[PDB]
Design a protein around this ligand. Structure first.
Ligand SMILES: CCCCCCCCCCCCCC(=O)OC[C@H](CO)OC(=O)CCCCCCCCCCCCC
Ligand SMILES: *[C@@H]1O[C@H](CO)[C@@H](O)[C@H](O)[C@H]1NC(C)=O
Ligand SMILES: *[C@@H]1O[C@H](CO)[C@@H](O)[C@H](O)[C@H]1NC(C)=O
Ligand SMILES: [Ca+2]
Ligand SMILES: [Ca+2]
Ligand SMILES: [Ca+2]
Length: 521
């Protein structure tokens, strides 16, 4: 727990220092300026002012002595001994620390219960706001409709996206796809006329942080461009666990910020058959791996008897080789364990998916890409003064036991190579499972990651490989990379296994004519 506290202190004190530098101001003014940028929502501004009240005068004192954020946070004891973010020799650290010494909430009784209620729903990966308990929400975050189709009736547990339509939806839109009622000419229900025989299916992601599109905007950490507008998305991002599933390559339903034209798998499936409107679920968690998926897979919502079938993407693309343990190789999953873990998941899916479903296993990428692309580039926190490379950033995180992938985010080339060998072996295990293992309620397919193909296509497009990686964590594929990978999966399945995606619905135009945007998302 010291790790996060240390990292959080070092980030905050770094922004304060750089805001002072950028604006040529006192530290007092820089702290007031940061608080002025933060929204009131989620008590962020008030928390900022509380911190300034509590620690402001000590921060002023130490930053005035020209100590950097890492030293300050040890001195204030947010960090406990020594992890260097900024380049400074050991001798200079011992100097500064002796001089520093020389120079120098859910316990609220009315919050405890709601805090536990929120921690629980997050741990179970189910929406906190869900009156009828069908796991679909009217609220966007806290596992709400950013993560799955919005509930059109939160007072009816039999109304939710992906349901087979009750009574062809004559009187209610029971599956939230915006199609319901009867044609006045022939009295035929629109959902019957427009969706019967079209074989609707949902998209379900079983994913990790990359699949849920973990993303810390570098705008939150770069003083030179910071403003009130930088942090408007901070409350919702925090209550989404710093994930942005609504923009992900598999389950995204908002229009891309990036400016590439590639669309999510959900968007493509909705476009192929508009009856699939709102039928997405991101069953994804930061840190998810083949080993621990069983701890939250029960949050998936698909009633075997009453729901349309689904396409399920199994996308554990790294945490079976990526971990934060100093001796990192012993915690990497073995091929034999991977086989046992995946078979357990598939056996579980078989008894919880409607017949006619499809499961796609994703291979693991080769992540040596991370070090090679980034190690000599400057991290957002090092860009002002050109003093924190990604190598220094990775080393700092490793010292804090917070590096999310010690095997690849490492200056040790032999270890980077070993990690890639293991990832390939695990991908080959997934491949073999898809080729040889059969289940009653779904068929099973393998698609490799093949980031070399994505990097090549990106290079043809005029891009550089470093532009495919989240700038703040230096680890996850960013929104562009995620959409490029989803496009590759879509095309490959379209070419080899077109039945997985179904046919285009010939009534799509008539659906749009009668129902417009089908209620939106
Ligand atoms: C581009 C494709 C080819 C190369 C890709 C390389 C392999 C990618 C594997 C991603 C697999 C997802 C693993 C995961 O869930 O992540 C898990 C970890 C934790 O277990 O996620 C994290 O928590 C990352 C945290 C890193 C810390 C960064 C600190 C940023 C400063 C904090 C400021 C925030 C203030 C609100
Ligand atoms: C939602 O379902 C309930 C039935 O439990 C019904 O009373 C209510 O009218 C429904 N809402 C809409 C908009 O149909
Ligand atoms: C680099 O990684 C390999 C593989 O784990 C290990 O044997 C070696 O000791 C590491 N080198 C250093 C300098 O730590
Ligand atoms: Ca409902
Ligand atoms: Ca609900
Ligand atoms: Ca409907």
């Amino acid at each position: 727990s010291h790790g996060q506290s240390c990292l959080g202190c070092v980030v905050l004190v770094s922004v304060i220092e750089q805001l002072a530098e950028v604006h040529n101001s006192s530290v007092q003014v820089a702290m007031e300026r940061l608080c002025s940028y933060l929204p009131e929502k989620l008590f962020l501004k008030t928390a900022c002012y509380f911190l300034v009240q509590t620690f402001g005068s000590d921060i002023i004192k130490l930053l005035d002595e020209a100590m950097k954020a890492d030293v300050v946070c040890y001195a204030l004891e947010f960090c406990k001994r020594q992890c260097h973010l900024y380049p400074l020799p050991q001798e200079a650290w011992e100097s500064a620390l002796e001089k520093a010494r020389q120079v120098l909430i859910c316990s609220l009784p009315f919050l405890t219960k709601i805090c536990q209620k929120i921690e629980l729903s997050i741990k179970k990966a189910v929406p906190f706001k869900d009156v009828d308990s069908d796991k679909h929400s009217v609220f966007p975050t806290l596992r709400g409709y950013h993560w799955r189709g919005r509930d059109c009736n939160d007072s009816d547990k039999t109304v939710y996206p992906g349901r087979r339509p009750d009574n062809w939806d004559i009187h209610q839109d029971s599956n939230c796809n915006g199609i319901w009622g009867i044609d006045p000419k022939d009295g035929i229900p629109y959902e019957k006329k427009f969706c019967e025989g079209s074989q609707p299916r949902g998209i379900i992601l079983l994913g990790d942080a990359a699949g849920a599109h973990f993303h810390i905007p570098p705008e939150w950490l770069t003083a030179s461009q910071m403003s009130v507008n930088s942090f408007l998305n901070l409350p919702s991002a925090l209550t989404d666990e710093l994930n942005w599933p609504q923009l992900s390559g598999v389950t995204g339903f908002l229009d891309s910020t990036s400016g590439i034209e590639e669309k999510s798998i959900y968007h493509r499936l909705r476009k192929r058959n508009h009856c699939n409107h709102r039928d997405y679920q991101s069953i994804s968690k930061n840190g998810a791996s083949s080993r621990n998926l069983k701890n939250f897979i029960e949050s998936l919502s698909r009633n075997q008897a009453s729901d349309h079938p689904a396409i399920v993407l199994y996308a554990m693309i790294g945490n079976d080789v990526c971990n934060s343990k100093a001796d990192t190789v012993p915690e990497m999953t073995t091929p034999e364990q991977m086989y046992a873990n995946v078979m357990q998941t598939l056996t579980h899916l078989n008894s919880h998916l409607p017949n006619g479903s499809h499961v796609i296993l994703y291979g693991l990428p080769d992540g040596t890409f991370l070090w090679d692309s980034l190690h000599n580039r400057y991290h957002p926190l090092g860009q002002l003064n050109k003093d924190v490379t990604y190598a220094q950033f990775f080393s700092f995180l490793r010292c804090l036991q917070l590096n999310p992938c010690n095997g690849w985010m490492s200056s040790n080339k032999t270890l980077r190579t070993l990690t890639s060998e293991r990832a390939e072996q695990l991908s080959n295990t997934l491949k073999k499972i898809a080729t040889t293992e059969t289940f009653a309620n779904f068929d099973l397919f393998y698609v490799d990651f093949a980031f070399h193909e994505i990097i090549e296509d990106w290079q043809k497009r005029g891009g550089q490989p470093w532009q495919l990686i989240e700038p703040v964590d230096g680890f996850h594929p960013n929104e562009v990379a995620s959409l490029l990978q989803a496009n590759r999966v879509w095309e490959k399945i379209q070419l080899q296994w077109p039945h997985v995606l179904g046919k285009e619905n010939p009534f799509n135009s008539q659906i749009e004519e009668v129902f417009g945007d089908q209620g939106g998302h």
